[PDB]
Amino acid sequence: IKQAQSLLGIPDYSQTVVDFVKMFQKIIFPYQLVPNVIIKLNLFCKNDSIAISSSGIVPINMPDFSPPNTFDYSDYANRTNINFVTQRVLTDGGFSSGITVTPVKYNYYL
Protein backbone atom coordinates (compact mmCIF):
# COMPACT_ATOMS: atom_id res chain seq x y z
CA ILE A 1 0.00 0.00 0.00
CA LYS A 2 2.84 2.38 0.82
CA GLN A 3 4.48 1.67 -2.53
CA ALA A 4 1.21 2.32 -4.36
CA GLN A 5 0.73 5.54 -2.40
CA SER A 6 4.26 6.76 -3.13
CA LEU A 7 3.66 5.94 -6.79
CA LEU A 8 0.48 8.03 -6.98
CA GLY A 9 -1.00 8.81 -3.56
CA ILE A 10 0.47 12.08 -2.34
CA PRO A 11 -1.03 12.60 1.15
CA ASP A 12 -1.56 10.35 4.17
CA TYR A 13 -5.28 9.74 4.46
CA SER A 14 -6.71 8.36 7.69
CA GLN A 15 -8.05 5.19 6.05
CA THR A 16 -5.84 5.23 2.97
CA VAL A 17 -6.13 1.44 2.62
CA VAL A 18 -9.92 1.75 2.48
CA ASP A 19 -9.41 4.67 0.10
CA PHE A 20 -7.45 2.56 -2.38
CA VAL A 21 -9.82 -0.35 -2.12
CA LYS A 22 -12.93 1.77 -2.68
CA MET A 23 -11.24 3.76 -5.45
CA PHE A 24 -11.04 0.41 -7.23
CA GLN A 25 -14.45 -0.73 -5.97
CA LYS A 26 -15.74 1.98 -8.28
CA ILE A 27 -14.46 -0.09 -11.23
CA ILE A 28 -14.71 -3.73 -10.07
CA PHE A 29 -18.16 -4.22 -11.60
CA PRO A 30 -18.36 -2.58 -15.05
CA TYR A 31 -15.15 -4.03 -16.49
CA GLN A 32 -15.77 -7.48 -14.94
CA LEU A 33 -12.33 -8.18 -13.47
CA VAL A 34 -10.52 -8.16 -10.14
CA PRO A 35 -8.49 -5.02 -9.36
CA ASN A 36 -4.90 -6.17 -8.98
CA VAL A 37 -4.66 -4.37 -5.63
CA ILE A 38 -6.99 -7.01 -4.18
CA ILE A 39 -4.99 -9.83 -5.78
CA LYS A 40 -1.71 -8.62 -4.29
CA LEU A 41 -3.52 -7.94 -1.00
CA ASN A 42 -4.08 -11.70 -0.77
CA LEU A 43 -1.53 -20.68 -2.83
CA PHE A 44 -5.13 -21.29 -3.97
CA CYS A 45 -7.84 -19.58 -1.84
CA LYS A 46 -8.56 -17.67 -5.04
CA ASN A 47 -10.90 -14.75 -4.43
CA ASP A 48 -13.88 -13.61 -6.48
CA SER A 49 -16.89 -11.28 -6.35
CA ILE A 50 -20.49 -11.24 -7.50
CA ALA A 51 -23.38 -9.33 -8.95
CA ILE A 52 -27.07 -10.11 -8.58
CA SER A 53 -26.82 -11.62 -12.06
CA SER A 54 -25.03 -14.95 -12.44
CA SER A 55 -21.37 -14.34 -13.32
CA GLY A 56 -18.02 -14.73 -11.61
CA ILE A 57 -15.07 -12.39 -11.83
CA VAL A 58 -11.56 -13.72 -12.45
CA PRO A 59 -12.32 -15.17 -15.93
CA ILE A 60 -16.01 -14.15 -15.78
CA ASN A 61 -16.52 -17.61 -14.30
CA MET A 62 -19.78 -19.50 -14.00
CA PRO A 63 -20.97 -20.17 -10.43
CA ASP A 64 -19.55 -23.73 -10.44
CA PHE A 65 -15.73 -23.76 -10.84
CA SER A 66 -12.78 -23.74 -13.26
CA PRO A 67 -13.87 -25.82 -16.28
CA PRO A 68 -11.88 -29.04 -16.76
CA ASN A 69 -11.41 -29.11 -20.55
CA THR A 70 -13.14 -26.52 -22.72
CA PHE A 71 -11.03 -26.33 -25.88
CA ASP A 72 -7.67 -27.37 -27.34
CA TYR A 73 -4.52 -25.24 -27.48
CA SER A 74 -3.09 -26.74 -30.67
CA ASP A 75 -2.57 -23.42 -32.46
CA TYR A 76 -0.81 -21.82 -29.47
CA ALA A 77 0.98 -24.29 -27.17
CA ASN A 78 3.06 -25.63 -30.06
CA ARG A 79 6.66 -24.45 -29.80
CA THR A 80 6.69 -23.41 -33.46
CA ASN A 81 4.08 -20.66 -33.03
CA ILE A 82 5.62 -19.18 -29.88
CA ASN A 83 9.08 -19.23 -31.49
CA PHE A 84 7.79 -17.54 -34.65
CA VAL A 85 6.11 -14.76 -32.69
CA THR A 86 9.18 -14.30 -30.49
CA GLN A 87 11.44 -13.98 -33.53
CA ARG A 88 9.03 -11.54 -35.18
CA VAL A 89 8.92 -9.23 -32.16
CA LEU A 90 12.68 -9.47 -31.61
CA THR A 91 13.41 -8.60 -35.24
CA ASP A 92 10.94 -5.70 -35.24
CA GLY A 93 12.21 -4.22 -31.99
CA GLY A 94 15.92 -4.77 -32.49
CA PHE A 95 16.29 -6.54 -29.14
CA SER A 96 18.60 -9.45 -28.44
CA SER A 97 17.05 -10.71 -25.19
CA GLY A 98 14.89 -9.67 -22.27
CA ILE A 99 11.54 -10.38 -23.97
CA THR A 100 9.33 -13.33 -23.04
CA VAL A 101 6.23 -14.54 -24.89
CA THR A 102 3.58 -16.73 -23.29
CA PRO A 103 0.59 -18.29 -25.09
CA VAL A 104 -2.84 -17.09 -24.08
CA LYS A 105 -3.65 -20.21 -22.11
CA TYR A 106 -5.54 -18.86 -19.08
CA ASN A 107 -8.77 -18.87 -21.10
CA TYR A 108 -11.37 -20.62 -18.95
CA TYR A 109 -14.24 -19.68 -21.25
CA LEU A 110 -15.12 -16.52 -23.16
Binding site: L8, F24, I27, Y31, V37
Partner: protein
Protein backbone atom coordinates in the same frame (compact mmCIF):
# COMPACT_ATOMS: atom_id res chain seq x y z
CA UNK B 1 12.18 -2.93 -18.12
CA UNK B 2 13.78 -3.42 -21.54
CA UNK B 3 10.65 -2.46 -23.49
CA UNK B 4 10.97 1.07 -22.09
CA UNK B 5 13.64 1.92 -24.64
CA UNK B 6 15.32 5.05 -23.28
CA UNK B 7 15.33 7.48 -26.18
CA UNK B 8 18.29 9.86 -26.23
CA UNK B 9 17.49 13.41 -27.34
CA UNK B 10 19.70 16.50 -27.39
CA UNK B 11 18.14 18.92 -26.53
CA UNK B 12 15.22 17.31 -24.64
CA UNK B 13 12.08 16.84 -26.71
CA UNK B 14 9.29 19.30 -25.99
CA UNK B 15 5.80 17.84 -25.56
CA UNK B 16 2.30 19.26 -25.90
CA UNK B 17 -0.80 18.41 -23.89
CA UNK B 18 -1.04 16.81 -20.49
CA UNK B 19 2.04 15.05 -19.13
CA UNK B 20 2.39 12.93 -15.99
CA UNK B 21 5.63 12.00 -14.23
CA UNK B 22 6.03 8.33 -13.32
CA UNK B 23 9.70 7.80 -12.41
CA UNK B 24 11.35 11.22 -12.32
CA UNK B 25 14.60 9.49 -11.37
CA UNK B 26 14.41 7.23 -14.44
CA UNK B 27 12.55 9.67 -16.74
CA UNK B 28 9.36 7.65 -17.19
CA UNK B 29 6.51 9.85 -18.39
CA UNK B 30 2.86 9.25 -19.20
CA UNK B 31 1.36 11.33 -22.01
CA UNK B 32 -2.18 11.53 -23.33
CA UNK B 33 -2.42 10.29 -26.91
CA UNK B 34 -5.48 9.89 -29.11
CA UNK B 35 -5.65 8.06 -32.42
CA UNK B 36 -7.59 9.90 -35.14
CA UNK B 37 -10.38 7.41 -34.39
CA UNK B 38 -10.69 9.18 -31.02
CA UNK B 39 -9.67 6.05 -29.13
CA UNK B 40 -8.24 7.67 -25.99
CA UNK B 41 -5.07 6.12 -24.61
CA UNK B 42 -1.81 6.95 -22.87
CA UNK B 43 1.75 6.29 -24.01
CA UNK B 44 4.29 5.18 -21.41
CA UNK B 45 7.39 6.68 -22.97
CA UNK B 46 10.85 6.79 -21.41
CA UNK B 47 13.52 9.27 -22.42
CA UNK B 48 14.27 12.98 -22.55
CA UNK B 49 11.08 15.03 -22.68
CA UNK B 50 9.67 18.30 -21.38
CA UNK B 51 6.14 19.66 -21.28
CA UNK B 52 4.89 23.10 -22.25
CA UNK B 53 2.60 23.17 -19.20
CA UNK B 54 2.52 22.02 -15.60
CA UNK B 55 2.73 18.25 -15.20
CA UNK B 56 -0.55 17.02 -13.76
CA UNK B 57 -0.67 14.50 -10.94
CA UNK B 58 -0.98 10.75 -11.42
CA UNK B 59 -3.88 10.55 -8.94
CA UNK B 60 -6.38 12.15 -11.34
CA UNK B 61 -6.83 9.29 -13.81
CA UNK B 62 -9.70 6.93 -14.51
CA UNK B 63 -9.04 4.12 -11.99
CA UNK B 64 -8.72 1.63 -14.83
CA UNK B 65 -5.51 3.35 -15.91
CA UNK B 66 -4.33 3.42 -12.31
CA UNK B 67 -4.77 -0.34 -11.87
CA UNK B 68 -2.92 -0.94 -15.12
CA UNK B 69 -0.07 1.27 -13.90
CA UNK B 70 0.02 -0.51 -10.54
CA UNK B 71 0.37 -3.89 -12.22
CA UNK B 72 3.00 -2.54 -14.61
CA UNK B 73 5.49 -0.38 -12.73
CA UNK B 74 5.81 -2.06 -9.34
CA UNK B 75 8.04 -5.16 -9.47
CA UNK B 76 6.24 -8.39 -8.60
CA UNK B 77 9.24 -10.39 -7.37
CA UNK B 78 7.63 -10.92 -3.94
CA UNK B 79 5.10 -13.70 -3.34
Amino acid sequence: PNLLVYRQSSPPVRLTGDVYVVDKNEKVFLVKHVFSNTVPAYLLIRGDYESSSDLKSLRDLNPWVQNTLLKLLIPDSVQ
